[PDB]
Design an enzyme around this catalytic site. Structure first.
Site, short mmCIF file in Angstrom:
data_model
loop_
_atom_site.label_atom_id
_atom_site.label_comp_id
_atom_site.label_asym_id
_atom_site.label_seq_id
_atom_site.Cartn_x
_atom_site.Cartn_y
_atom_site.Cartn_z
N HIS A 41 -12.07 18.66 95.87
CA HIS A 41 -11.24 19.54 95.05
C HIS A 41 -11.17 19.08 93.58
O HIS A 41 -10.56 19.79 92.77
CB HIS A 41 -9.83 19.70 95.64
CG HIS A 41 -8.97 18.47 95.54
ND1 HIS A 41 -8.63 17.71 96.64
CD2 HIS A 41 -8.37 17.88 94.48
CE1 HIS A 41 -7.86 16.71 96.26
NE2 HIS A 41 -7.69 16.79 94.95
N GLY A 143 -2.34 12.33 91.15
CA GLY A 143 -3.39 11.49 90.64
C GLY A 143 -3.89 10.44 91.60
O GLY A 143 -4.90 9.79 91.30
N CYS A 145 -5.09 11.02 94.64
CA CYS A 145 -6.17 11.47 95.51
C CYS A 145 -7.46 10.70 95.18
O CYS A 145 -7.68 10.26 94.05
CB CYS A 145 -6.34 12.99 95.39
SG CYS A 145 -6.61 13.52 93.70
#
Ligand SMILES: *[C@@H](Cl)C(=O)N(c1cncc(Cl)c1)c1cccc(-c2cc(Cl)cc3cn(C)nc23)c1
Ligand SMILES: *[C@@H](Cl)C(=O)N(c1cncc(Cl)c1)c1cccc(-c2cc(Cl)cc3cn(C)nc23)c1
Lengths: 306, 306
Positions: A41, A143, A145
């Site tokens: 993503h 942030g 991820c």
């Protein structure tokens, strides 16, 4: 003695963390040999992230749309591809700090260490378990991820988890390192939600053995019970069933303490029916289920990693 | 979101750990620049360790009596000296992995990460607090002496703790890195014992703020209280007093949540008088006192270290 929620030394993993930017989205990537792994993503924007087609989105990207920063040194992307829910970014430099490693997928009930990261810089380390409903109860802000979870076995890092998202209840979901989600979660904005969890019974028993090894014995009793009669009580209190395999795995801890596995089940039965009545076990007033039999033997016996 | 007992990334410290052998005693040392720091009881034997004279014992030793191993590479000792309860072993090689660092001594109530080690090889990492009675509740087995505790501030490692011993109650004692014990403990076999502990009040309040930030609010109330009337209740339950300085330090967390500090004290008062009645806070059924206001802001806001 003593018993703590212990994580693995994180250094071998810190040397693999990088920053990956695409458009306005910045997140973390894992740099092993000449490939950087990150959540797919990264290529989505806010409105993309509603209902996206990732093949469509990715064919519209170029190598130069991915800025990779390893510290204060820019890595050049020379190829990209998608594998399930992760991106594989081929860079022109092999990570000189690459440890020996494996990509492994764990079972609900197993534990691992998490190196939380932001902008490719490690922030903290802590120990998690994969819940029976395939979430983890982590600590993750916007942030984070791309942060990974791992175990260490002598000198080899077994990566098991890459962080992707937070669910509405405050618990976390992600993928193994081949990009396959743990549990029925997708990297799209849906109304997805955790689903009912249970307590990891074999782990509670392991921790009760840790407590005896560390001098907490007030919960012991002369009683015993059959495996079937324990499981009838376990189900009542939303504990998962205990199998003969779990009994075998608790063997060494049984022999070290001299408390037969089924005797400790009788102890747990009474804790479930009576509560703890003002007392604590290993500094907890709850039955702790995020230590495996392995974790207890390791901590209460002292194995290192090199 | 989420809230975990988080340790600092341990890599910078892992690169300083070595093995120190003298006679039959093996333990851990800390290798910074060209000096290896280790507990001075390394030079004692079982019967020495009863009532020793360390100046006498040390003048009888030679440089060649100290085997230092940095991984599978032997370091040559070219000088030795005692500073308080630590040994300083001058070696012929500067540690190429030396981070920027400071030796700092912490206050009861402050937290730090521990890198547990055996034979110079890191085993696990976890977060501790210095108890008001100058012990720490760690996880340490035979051979872990010489493991260190530390904090990280951007890129600089502040070493605060070196492990020395376990007390009869299962809690742990050691020194700062200048070799001065925390608390009234000595590196001789006496009948020394912990002494009565208290709960770190400002930390419990910090953790209650962490809980509100993470969506636990059932313990909030419309009440309030004066600082003096709270402290009369705190003393009853063996909590240490709360000062105006503690109130000032809880300022930012107060402003972020909109719950005045003295209002949260009223909430804590009622928890102390009523207990929790079946409920939990941040996954705990006890009031947790090993997170500082700093730790909460850090975890609930996301600072990294490089
Ligand atoms: C990286 Cl961009 C990131 O860390 N998060 C995030 C992770 N954990 C906790 C929190 Cl609070 C944020 C992140 C940021 C933005 C979006 C998403 C995200 C991820 C997936 Cl897989 C699905 C999804 C659906 N929506 C609306 N946002 C999603 C994660
Ligand atoms: C290193 Cl040699 C070591 O790790 N320990 C130790 C530390 N923590 C827990 C446990 Cl169970 C052991 C150690 C081993 C042997 C002796 C001592 C020791 C240290 C001091 Cl400062 C004083 C003292 C008095 N006695 C009898 N033993 C002591 C620590």
């Amino acid at each position: 003695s003593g018993f703590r929620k212990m994580a693995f030394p994180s250094g071998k993993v810190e040397g693999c963390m990088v920053q990956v930017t695409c458009g306005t989205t910045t997140l973390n990537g894992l740099w092993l040999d000449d490939v950087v792994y990150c959540p797919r993503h990264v290529i989505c924007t806010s409105e993309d992230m509603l209902n996206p087609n990732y093949e469509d989105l990715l064919i519209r990207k170029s190598n130069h749309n991915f800025l990779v920063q390893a510290g204060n040194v820019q890595l050049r992307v020379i190829g990209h591809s998608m594998q399930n829910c992760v991106l594989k970014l081929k860079v022109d430099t092999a990570n000189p700090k690459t440890p020996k490693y494996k990509f492994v997928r764990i079972q609900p009930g197993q534990t691992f260490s998490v190196l939380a990261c932001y902008n490719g810089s490690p922030s903290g380390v802590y120990q998690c378990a994969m819940r029976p409903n395939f979430t983890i109860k982590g600590s993750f802000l916007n942030g984070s991820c791309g942060s990974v979870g791992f175990n260490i076995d002598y000198d080899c890092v077994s990566f098991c988890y890459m962080h992707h998202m937070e669910l509405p209840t405050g618990v976390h979901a992600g993928t193994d390192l081949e990009g396959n989600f743990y549990g029925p979660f997708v990297d799209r904005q849906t109304a997805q939600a955790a689903g009912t969890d249970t307590t990891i019974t074999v782990n509670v028993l392991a921790w009760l053995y840790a407590a005896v090894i560390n001098g907490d014995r007030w919960f012991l009793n002369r009683f015993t019970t059959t495996l079937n009669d324990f499981n009838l009580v376990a189900m009542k209190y939303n504990y998962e069933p205990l199998t003969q395999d779990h009994v075998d795995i608790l063997g060494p801890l049984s022999a070290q303490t001299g408390i037969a596995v089924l005797d400790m089940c009788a102890s747990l039965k009474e804790l479930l029916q009576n509560g703890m009545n003002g007392r604590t076990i290993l500094g907890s007033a709850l039955l702790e289920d995020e230590f495996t039999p392995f974790d207890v033997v390791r901590q209460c016996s002292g194995v290192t990693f090199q």
